[PDB]
Design a protein around this motif. Structure first.
Motif, short mmCIF file in Angstrom:
data_model
loop_
_atom_site.label_atom_id
_atom_site.label_comp_id
_atom_site.label_asym_id
_atom_site.label_seq_id
_atom_site.Cartn_x
_atom_site.Cartn_y
_atom_site.Cartn_z
N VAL A 1229 0.83 -1.21 0.00
CA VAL A 1229 0.00 0.00 0.00
C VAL A 1229 0.86 1.27 0.00
O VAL A 1229 1.73 1.43 0.86
CB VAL A 1229 -0.94 0.08 1.24
CG1 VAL A 1229 -1.85 1.31 1.14
CG2 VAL A 1229 -1.77 -1.18 1.38
N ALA A 1230 0.62 2.16 -0.96
CA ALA A 1230 1.31 3.45 -1.02
C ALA A 1230 0.34 4.59 -0.75
O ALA A 1230 -0.88 4.41 -0.75
CB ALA A 1230 1.97 3.63 -2.35
N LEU A 1231 0.89 5.78 -0.51
CA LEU A 1231 0.12 6.90 -0.01
C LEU A 1231 -0.69 6.59 1.28
O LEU A 1231 -1.65 7.29 1.58
CB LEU A 1231 -0.81 7.41 -1.12
CG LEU A 1231 -0.21 7.35 -2.54
CD1 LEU A 1231 -1.19 7.84 -3.58
CD2 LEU A 1231 1.11 8.12 -2.64
N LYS A 1232 -0.33 5.53 2.01
CA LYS A 1232 -0.83 5.28 3.37
C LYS A 1232 -1.09 6.54 4.20
O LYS A 1232 -0.22 7.38 4.37
CB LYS A 1232 0.10 4.37 4.18
CG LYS A 1232 0.21 2.93 3.68
CD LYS A 1232 1.02 2.08 4.65
CE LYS A 1232 2.47 1.95 4.22
NZ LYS A 1232 2.69 0.74 3.41
N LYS A 1257 7.42 5.44 4.29
CA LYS A 1257 6.52 5.57 3.16
C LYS A 1257 6.96 4.79 1.91
O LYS A 1257 7.93 5.17 1.26
CB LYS A 1257 6.29 7.05 2.81
CG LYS A 1257 5.27 7.77 3.71
CD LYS A 1257 4.37 8.74 2.93
CE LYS A 1257 2.99 8.88 3.57
NZ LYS A 1257 2.42 10.25 3.43
N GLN A 1258 6.26 3.70 1.61
CA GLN A 1258 6.38 3.06 0.30
C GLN A 1258 5.92 4.03 -0.78
O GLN A 1258 4.91 4.70 -0.63
CB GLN A 1258 5.53 1.80 0.21
CG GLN A 1258 6.00 0.63 1.02
CD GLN A 1258 5.20 -0.62 0.71
OE1 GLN A 1258 4.18 -0.90 1.35
NE2 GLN A 1258 5.64 -1.38 -0.29
NA NA Z 1 3.09 5.37 2.04
#
Ligand code: NA
Ligand SMILES: *[C@@H]1O[C@H](CO)[C@@H](O[C@@H]2O[C@H](CO)[C@@H](O)[C@H](O)[C@H]2NC(C)=O)[C@H](O)[C@H]1NC(C)=O
Ligand code: NAG
Ligand code: NAG
Ligand code: NAG
Ligand code: NAG
Ligand code: CL
Ligand code: NA
Length: 1274
Positions: A1229-1232, A1257-1258
């Motif tokens: 998951v990105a923009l978590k 942050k991924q």
């Molecule tokens: Na993220």
């Protein structure tokens, strides 16, 4: 001498002993026969002649009780002989079996069972028309009881629903007849939790030397079912050459790997090669290691010799067969070679028949010493085995062979064949556990002898026959069933000879007796794998069809004992096809059923009981496998948040015989899904991948969620232009940034005469809805199983699954409602709630805050009386158990009448002893008084208690205490009741603008609710209306109140008041008028409760509601606030710190919480901590470590698919309550968005703290695979 009698004794049954004298030394033998807590003293001086039987009868005494019995045969006069035997006494004429559709169950699961009762003839007992069945949980609490469980053809069927969070461990089904246990059976209730996974390693094809290689299937699965992704390191050890073959591969649930040998040349025809597989789960790096020995074979088949008897007879034919099998056990057909037995000049060059046999009939002449059976095939294979001739001392046998059908009143003909030329042999006949008949037969030095016997009535319908002789100095025997075919239940079951295919249907064909009951059941061998250690039902029922189970003792099994001379030896998912059906008119029935859509192997069984012909069974269980040609399996996060970029990962499986391109299509259901990199209008996204046979292949889609709520994950997959498809319909919960705390404003009207009234409402992104409800219980009944937005895992809170159901039924009975769906719903959940509450019962009979802890006076009074009340509506409540609890309660009372707390202080205002124990004392009395049966059986507690209140009354200055005391006094009709209520009224507050009256304590809903109950008892209906106005407006969105006691007292008060002020009939119009438009509702049905009249105002400023008519109603506005997620504290300090894990995939979060004491208030009530995780993270098996010991976590609750952890404490002061939580990143998951932790006081939620935290942050550019990486990257 050979003595044989039954081993089992009964009240009246004639006990027949048989003595066979084959000793040729003397001409008669004299014996003494003792037969004996000795409630028997029967002796018999007895005389047995040479070469003869003697049958001695023993009339058993009708009045036998369980004891210790013996029989002793002593050789009197010049013949020495002492033999002895234990005789087991039986009280029952009947036996019992329990069948259970599964061996292990999960929480939300139904147990189905059947109780089978049969008499000595294996038919339903005529005497016994019903049984006493009871089920109880792993701590012996009775959960369901059938006092008169009626039999139908000897069978009683029923079920038990296991609760959503039940008591785990071993349950016990227990059956009784006339207060005597007949049979019991256990089943298990386990939780899948076990996030650990199983690994399997087997050859994908039988390895042959010529292959110069081993092909291995590696398979990794969690226990519930989903595939595991990981890297498997495969080692294979060749120790003769100090060598080792290695290979690594990524496995998505299932993989294949080939290991090639260099110069593999075995010395023998077989060779075991050890293999080790280390499977490392993807992110967790959790390792499971699996080993096995893997045989490499030179030939695709093997041979063993199968002989009619272990040795051959010198001058007689010897039947045997060479049995060819593949190395998987199956028959090997068409294998050719050349058999020869040179001792007989025998020879044949043939091939193995369709059963894999080469049958041989060899003929040794009397001269022949042995038979050397050779077989040689042109591939180099050879098999030699020697058969030796019978030696009398160790090899002699006797066998029995039925030569005629066994019909009633006809003769039974048998050919007795012995290896020796017989001088004698004996026979015996048993039926119903006694010896019907016997005889001393005297062949005239003959190897064969034809035995003929008349079938008598005592042998009907089931008997057995045992023969036996002495050869050398061993007693050889054989036996046979005497099944009178015309009197038996001839049951049989079968499936069509096809491949049984998932989703399609099969035709069960069965035959037997017209009337006969038939019980069917199918189990997948998977279930039977994890637990075959405990008793299998098919073994149980098969055994009852025959006899009684170190090495196989024929006499034990036949219900007998034998004895002889000292120097003589004896020789040597959901359930499927749990249907019950009847055989009908023509003696046959065809059931037709749908095969479940799953890949597994089945074990289908079927028995049958006719009221007259009795029990009938199928030889062996039917077996078959169903194999899904092609399926797809999801692996999704439980939740995500709007705007986050998630990879939805799936895995494909292809079981056909070739590699096929699969097309997976993910649908955008109702504008819920954005496919990253494709316009918002797209309704689907299709990808393709090749899928080899028996290899998991991943496929994934990068998406963003657009709508709060439930996102439908809708996938379709297919492989050969749609000739093979699978589909998935699953759910991901899309959630808001911050925990939304909904507020509901409500105003109620109650018109007796026709009235017009106009309610203006000032409103205050935040979505809002108006609702019209005709009843306080409308939304409550609709939400009965999920009333609060707060965890409820403690003993007090768990009553929310119990009490609200009672209040509903109390009210539906009071108004005499006939809306059956509701009475059914509340009744069913009430039953589920009983089971659930028993978790908190303690050894002493009381109830505690946790599964195991010191009992609480408050909780024992609360639960005990509440259960007493529940007896009205359900019959499953254990009365003795309630009695025990209330006795424990009564014993805690002081001489003065006062009650003090016991166990942990979780609710200060109730349990606290700062104000002379008035609250707790008033509550206990109130709880007892509310129930007539409890009031009667504990009059003493009430008397002493009311005296206490009478003495303390002058000093009662706290409105909470006084409201409970007053309500008790009202229930009791205490002289001080009018005075107490007046005092309580004096403490009340008002809001004149809102026409509200209430009490301002730290628990104002409880206090005001208790006050309203007393208003109702005192018939103060007009002054009560302002009190109701206030209460109705503190309601949580579901119609309950936001907490537990608030709900229990609050709803009791509101419904009681409602019963009295509510008009006889509703007939009113509500005009909802907002912005410009106008919505309309009409309610003309009084009785109706199940009614939606929801409605969504838009981003509006004001709102106008015009009611007109007569009747009762609730005008509700519900706000769904979306506050920004922000740090906050009030009377708690909460600190978070992420610990350096050294892995991007592991999160170690240290949480520390403490109460901020102020003045007299040094500690909180019960406190929870909830930890919420960032999207895509999941907690481990036991995620908590490094706990502080000062004030321990009493309960850890993991929920929302390992997304949320709730930790419970009795209370906190200024000690630093710390722990460390470990979670792994399972989904990309990105923009978590950030996550948070909360701590709060349970019974006063204004006291709380919340702290946000973020994770590394991924980036979207790492997440995506190349195709869908958007136009902002590279
Ligand atoms: Na993220
Ligand atoms: C399955 O077995 C049940 C017994 O458990 C059969 O149900 C009974 O039917 C008889 C009349 O045929 C009634 O006397 C009983 O009241 C029924 N028992 C119950 C509790 O339902 C049922 O008929 C069987 N089903 C089929 C299709 O054969
Ligand atoms: C189950 O109950 C039976 C009697 O109904 C009893 O004999 C047996 O001990 C019980 N099983 C366990 C697990 O204690
Ligand atoms: C072993 O597996 C490989 C890879 O699929 C296959 O080519 C080979 O035919 C298999 N070996 C045998 C003897 O089937
Ligand atoms: C109720 O009591 C609380 C705490 O003492 C106080 O903050 C609040 O102002 C009171 N409410 C009213 C209306 O008196
Ligand atoms: C698991 O191993 C991989 C590769 O060795 C590594 O990148 C990752 O940090 C490890 N995860 C954990 C939980 O240690
Ligand atoms: Cl208590
Ligand atoms: Na208010």
């Amino acid at each position: 001498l050979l003595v044989v009698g039954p081993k089992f004794i009964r009240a009246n049954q004639e006990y027949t002993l048989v003595i066979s004298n084959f000793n040729s030394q003397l001409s008669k033998v004299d014996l003494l026969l003792k037969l004996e807590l000795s409630v028997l003293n029967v002796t018999k001086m007895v005389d047995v002649r040479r070469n003869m039987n003697r049958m001695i009868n023993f009339n058993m005494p009708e009045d036998l009780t369980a004891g210790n019995y013996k029989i002793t045969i002593d050789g009197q006069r010049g013949f020495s002989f002492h033999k002895e035997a234990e005789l087991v006494y039986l009280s029952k004429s009947i036996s019992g079996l329990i069948q259970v559709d599964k061996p292990v169950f999960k929480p939300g699961d139904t147990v189905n069972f059947r109780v089978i009762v049969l008499d000595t003839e294996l038919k339903p007992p005529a005497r016994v028309k019903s049984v006493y069945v009871t089920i109880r949980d792993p701590q012996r609490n009775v959960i369901r009881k059938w006092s008169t469980a009626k039999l139908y053809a000897g069978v009683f069927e029923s079920d038990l629903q296991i609760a959503p969070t039940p008591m785990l461990g071993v349950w016990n089904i227990s059956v009784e007849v006339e207060g005597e246990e007949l049979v019991s059976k256990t089943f298990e209730v386990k939780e899948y939790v076990l996030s650990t996974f199983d690994v399997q390693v087997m050859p994908s094809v039988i390895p042959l030397e010529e292959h110069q290689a081993v092909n291995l299937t590696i398979e990794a699965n969690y226990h519930f079912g989903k595939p595991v992704q990981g890297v498997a390191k495969v080692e294979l050890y060749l120790d003769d050459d100090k060598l080792k073959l290695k290979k690594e591969l990524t496995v998505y649930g299932k993989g294949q790997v080939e290991l090639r040998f260099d110069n593999f040349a075995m010395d023998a025809d077989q060779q075991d090669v050890p293999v080790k597989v280390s499977f490392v789960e993807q992110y967790t790096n959790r390792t499971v290691v699996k080993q096995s020995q893997i045989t490499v074979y030179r030939y695709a088949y093997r041979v063993e010799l199968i002989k009619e008897s272990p040795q051959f007879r010198p001058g007689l034919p010897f039947k045997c067969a060479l049995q060819f099998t593949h190395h998987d056990g199956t028959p090997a057909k068409g294998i050719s070679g050349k058999v020869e037995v040179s001792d007989v000049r025998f020879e044949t060059t043939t091939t193995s028949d369709n059963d894999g046999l080469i049958k041989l009939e060899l003929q040794p002449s009397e001269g022949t010493e042995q038979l050397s059976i050779h077989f040689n095939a042109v591939d180099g294979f050879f098999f030699y085995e020697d058969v030796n001739k019978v030696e009398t001392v160790t090899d002699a046998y006797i066998k029995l062979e039925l030569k005629s059908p066994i019909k009633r009143n006809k003769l039974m003909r048998f050919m007795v064949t012995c290896t020796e030329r017989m001088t004698f042999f004996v026979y015996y006949v048993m039926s119903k556990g006694n010896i019907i008949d016997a005889g001393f037969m005297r062949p005239n030095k003959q190897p064969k002898y034809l035995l003929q016997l008349n079938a008598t009535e005592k042998m009907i319908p089931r008997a057995k026959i045992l023969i036996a002789t002495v050869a050398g100095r061993t007693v050889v025997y054989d036996f046979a069933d005497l099944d009178f075919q015309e009197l038996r239940n001839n049951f049989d079951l079968s499936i069509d000879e096809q491949e049984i295919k998932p989703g399609r249907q099969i035709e069960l064909s069965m035959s037997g007796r017209p009337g006969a009951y038939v019980g069917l059941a199918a189990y997948d061998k998977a279930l039977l794998l994890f637990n075959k250690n405990h008793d299998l039902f098919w073994e149980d029922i098969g055994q009852v069809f025959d006899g009684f189970h170190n090495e196989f003792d024929i006499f034990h099994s036949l219900g007998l004992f034998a004895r002889t001379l000292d120097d003589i030896l004896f020789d040597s998912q959901e359930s499927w096809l749990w249907k019950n059906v009847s055989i009908g008119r023509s003696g046959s029935r065809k059931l037709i059923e749908v095969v479940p859509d799953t890949t597994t192997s089945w074990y289908l069984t079927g028995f049958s009981i006719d009221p007259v012909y009795g029990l009938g069974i199928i030889k062996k269980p039917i077996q078959f496998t169903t194999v899904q040609p092609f399926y797809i399996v999801e692996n999704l996060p439980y939740s995500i948040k709007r705007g986050e970029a998630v990879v939805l990962q799936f895995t494909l499986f292809n079981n056909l015989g070739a590699e096929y391109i699969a097309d997976v299509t993910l649908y955008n259901v109702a504008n819920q899904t954005e496919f990253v990199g494709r316009p918002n209008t797209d309704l689907s996204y299709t990808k393709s991948v090749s899928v080899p046979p028996k290899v998991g292949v991943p496929i994934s889609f990068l998406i963003k969620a657009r709508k709060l709520g439930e996102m439908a994950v809708r996938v379709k997959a297919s492989i050969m232009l749609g000739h093979e498809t699978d589909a998935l319909e699953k759910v991901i919960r899309v959630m808001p940034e911050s925990l939304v705390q909904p507020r509901m404003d409500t105003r109620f009207f109650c018109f007796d005469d026709h009235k017009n009234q106009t309610f203006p409402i000032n409103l205050d992104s935040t979505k809002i809805e108006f609702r019209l409800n005709p009843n306080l219980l409308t939304t409550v009944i609709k939400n009965l199983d999920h009333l609060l937005g707060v965890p409820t895992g403690c003993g007090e809170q768990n009553m929310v699954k119990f009490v609200p159901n009672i209040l509903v039924l109390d009210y539906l009975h009071a108004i005499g409602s006939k809306e059956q769906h509701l009475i059914d719903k509340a009744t069913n959940l009430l039953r589920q709630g009983y089971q659930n509450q028993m978790r908190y019962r303690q050894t002493d009979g009381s109830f505690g805050l946790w599964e195991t802890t010191n009992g609480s006076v408050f909780l024992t009074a609360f639960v005990g009386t509440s259960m007493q009340t529940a007896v009205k509506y359900i019959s499953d409540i254990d009365a003795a158990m309630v009695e025990k609890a209330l006795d424990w309660l009564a014993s805690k009372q002081h001489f003065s009448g006062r009650f003090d707390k016991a166990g942990a202080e979780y609710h200060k205002e109730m349990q606290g002893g700062l104000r002379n124990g008035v609250a707790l004392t008033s509550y206990v009395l109130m709880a007892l008084l509310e129930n007539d049966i409890a009031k009667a059986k504990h009059a003493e507690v009430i008397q002493k208690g009311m005296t206490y209140l009478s003495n303390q009354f002058g000093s009662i200055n706290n409105a909470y205490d006084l409201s409970i005391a007053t309500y008790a006094m009202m229930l009791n009709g205490h002289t001080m009741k009018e005075e107490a209520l007046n005092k309580l009224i004096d403490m009340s507050f008002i809001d004149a603008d809102k026409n509200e009256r209430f009490w301002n304590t730290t628990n104002p809903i409880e206090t005001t609710a208790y006050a309203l109950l007393s208003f109702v008892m005192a018939e103060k209906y007009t002054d009560g209306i302002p009190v109701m106005n206030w209460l109705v407006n503190q309601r949580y969105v579901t119609g309950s109140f936001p907490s537990t006691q608030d709900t229990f007292v609050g709803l009791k008060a509101l419904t009681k008041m409602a019963e009295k002020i509510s008009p006889s009939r509703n007939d009113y119009t509500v005009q909802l008028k907002y912005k410009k438009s106008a919505k309309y509702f009409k309610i003309n049905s009084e009785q109706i409760d199940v009614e939606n009249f929801v409605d969504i105002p838009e981003d509006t400023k004001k709102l106008e509601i015009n009611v007109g008519g007569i009747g009762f109603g609730l005008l509700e506005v519900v706000y769904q606030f979306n506050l920004n997620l922000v740090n906050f504290e009030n009377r708690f300090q909460l600190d978070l710190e992420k610990q350096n894990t050294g892995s991007d995939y592991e999160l170690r979060l240290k949480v520390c919480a403490s109460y901020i004491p102020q003045l007299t208030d040094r500690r909180s009530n019960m406190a929870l901590i909830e930890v919420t995780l960032p999207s895509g993270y999941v907690v481990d098996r036991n995620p908590i470590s490094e706990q502080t010991k000062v004030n321990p976590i009493q309960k850890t609750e993991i929920r929302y698919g390992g997304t949320s952890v709730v930790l419970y404490y009795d209370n906190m002061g200024s000690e630093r309550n710390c722990f460390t939580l470990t979670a792994y990143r399972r989904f990309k998951v990105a923009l978590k968005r950030p996550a948070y932790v909360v701590v709060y006081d349970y019974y006063n939620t204004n006291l709380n703290a919340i702290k946000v935290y973020e994770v590394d942050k991924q980036n979207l550019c790492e997440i995506c695979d190349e195709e869908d990486c958007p136009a902002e990257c590279g």
